[PDB]
Amino acid sequence: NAVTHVSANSIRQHILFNNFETLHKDIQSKIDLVNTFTPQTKNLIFRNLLIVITNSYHLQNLLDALEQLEPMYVTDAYSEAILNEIGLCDKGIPNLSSIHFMIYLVSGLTKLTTKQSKILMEIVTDAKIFCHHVNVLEYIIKKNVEKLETVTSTLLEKYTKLPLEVTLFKESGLKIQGNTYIWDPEHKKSICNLYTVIKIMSYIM
């Protein structure tokens, strides 16, 4: 079941996201950027970010510090540690690639809802389950990202054997009951932002 869906809001989000290959190449370009970090840097960033996302206020100040190159704006020691690691600090030199990467990832995280941030904290404790969320969402996006339509469809039964916290997807506008979902292009930016965040996080965990 599909119906053409043209509003200004669906058009905007279709201009941003209409081609899975392009989206996936953009994500790969951020992941190869991660491959420039040492494992201790990746570890420090990943673990500190999981604490920062417990408080939207501190996460916003981290984003402002990154975007304005102004370490004075952070309001917590976990964000401060991130800035110290990438050189945005006294006696540091801010590393251009790392700043760009962190702006991208932190901006994506500020778009999550409180419930999504709480779920992310839960699912990161099991890498198989975390990756399963990534894989299921990737499949839905690959199937629907080119469509300027509201689509009702089902997941392959093979994608339903490991557990999911489907509220993670519902908070981005992907309605789900059982194995059936409704893809609405008015929520495409939220869904693709969520996928970009969890795809990238899976590579730093």
Residue numbers in the entry: 13 to 217
Publication text:
Viruses acquire host genes via horizontal gene transfer and can express them to manipulate host biology during infections. Some viral and host homologs retain sequence identity, but evolutionary divergence can obscure host origins. We used structural modeling to compare vaccinia virus proteins with metazoan proteomes. We identified vaccinia A47L as a homolog of gasdermins, the executioners of pyroptosis.
Our findings demonstrate the potential of structural homology screens to reveal genes that viruses capture from hosts and repurpose to benefit viral fitness.
